[PDB]
Amino acid sequence: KVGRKGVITVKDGKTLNDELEIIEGMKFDRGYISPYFINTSKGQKCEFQDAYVLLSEKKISSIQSIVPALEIANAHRKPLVIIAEDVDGEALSTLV
């Protein structure tokens, strides 16, 4: 599955039998910032299709810094995922 030079790791199981689990894509161990963003009841998951991706290396703080992106997203009627160093109080409150 992962090629002869892929990454394989060993972890403790909680079951009687061993299992093989395949990880595709990108796992980076960060959760949702705000529970308000949840849109799927079964499992409390955020599921979106054809989303825009915003990558910010620095923390996102200002209303002036955030408004243009949300305006673009609403104009194009597409979901937006914001990956940023952090979200400050004002931006977080406005988003939620």
Next chain:
Amino acid sequence: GQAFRKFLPLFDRVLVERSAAETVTKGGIMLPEKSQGKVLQATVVAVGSGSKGKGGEIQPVSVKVGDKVLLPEYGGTKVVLDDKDYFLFRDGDILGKYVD
């Protein structure tokens, strides 16, 4: 001077009412009521009699009731009239006047 709601500013003091703050952007996004801070748009509601600072006879105030004005960010004294907010300025503090 011209009184407003049974109140008249004295000398060159000017009474104005600020307009309501913007609540929705040009799009469909409305803004939290904590972010607007203070708005500098106001309408003149009452006018004083004249400047005591002029030597000799006092000159009349340069603005009239009903004028629309741009206010400074730093002045103003809080007063309450029938639960609506008004601010008292001197003629010299008003940044600008609007005309139609």
Next chain:
Amino acid sequence: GQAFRKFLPLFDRVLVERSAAETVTKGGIMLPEKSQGKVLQATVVAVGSGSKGKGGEIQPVSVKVGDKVLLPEYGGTKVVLDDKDYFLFRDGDILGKYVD
């Protein structure tokens, strides 16, 4: 100038008595006597002779005894007259005058 209770303010000083503070809301709920703070409604009880700050002849005070006025929140000197409280202002400090 016009004296009041054997006292006369000098020059452009103005003597006023604040009205009693509100004690019951518009409903039936009355308010604790610690919460009203200070009230800006007062009635003019005595008037000075005229402003020393005018060059040449002194001009008369713009207010008359018996006028009802809106006071500022920051001025006033404490004086006691027959155990009732009065405050001394300059003509320039009064925020407003009431008319009927």
Next chain:
Amino acid sequence: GQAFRKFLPLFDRVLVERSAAETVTKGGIMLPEKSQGKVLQATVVAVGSGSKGKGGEIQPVSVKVGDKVLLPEYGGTKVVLDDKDYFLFRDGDILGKYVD
């Protein structure tokens, strides 16, 4: 006074627009937008009516709309007109005027 974009400065206040900052050196090297700080070159866009500080009749403002000026580094009040930035000065604060 002469109004600009439906706005007129009052008395001896002067409204100006700063020119765009330099972005490329005399060579081909362009400069980061954080390093220019503030530019003192501006063009006069609106002019007030006259100085209240003159005794007697107010004198007209010494500058006219369209003049090019050198500004000081320390003054100015922030105002927003149709998302373009302007600054309000007194006639006395302008360091210089440009002529052609």
Next chain:
Amino acid sequence: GQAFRKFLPLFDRVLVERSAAETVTKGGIMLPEKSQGKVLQATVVAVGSGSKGKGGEIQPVSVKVGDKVLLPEYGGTKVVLDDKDYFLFRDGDILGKYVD
């Protein structure tokens, strides 16, 4: 007023150019360029129109372009003209004038 290099000071402002600092002592010992600090010798290059602080008509500036002057140690506003340094003073700040 008299303009200099397309620039004219306003009102009673005076534009001057400081002379070059001394670099060699009376002997043959020349001095490091960090030790002279600031020199108070300057030549008047431009002159304003007149003092706004005079009541009534403005009086002309007491100095003329080309005069040599002794400056104070504490005043001056930095301006750049074609990469040569000039300083703006009021007529009242100049310590002295030189005559030949």
Next chain:
Amino acid sequence: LNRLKVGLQVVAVKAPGFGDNRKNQLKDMAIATGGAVFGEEGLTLNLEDVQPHDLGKVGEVIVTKDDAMLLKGKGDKAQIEKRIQEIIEQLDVTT
């Protein structure tokens, strides 16, 4: 002071739970009684403009030194069921 001088029927009690647990109980009570939660970070509802329909209704309340009780809330059954369903789903996700 008002209660003493008028007999006004009012009582006040501390919010239970600490941290997000407090918020969870507050919302759960909001659905249970049919009221609303004021001051939420999202959709902040102001105390200055409280409305009669924003307050919950309870048939009986008993308060003592150690505890307080509301017995017969008036929350709508459909939202109550929604809340119970979401809670059991959260219970099933992570343990």
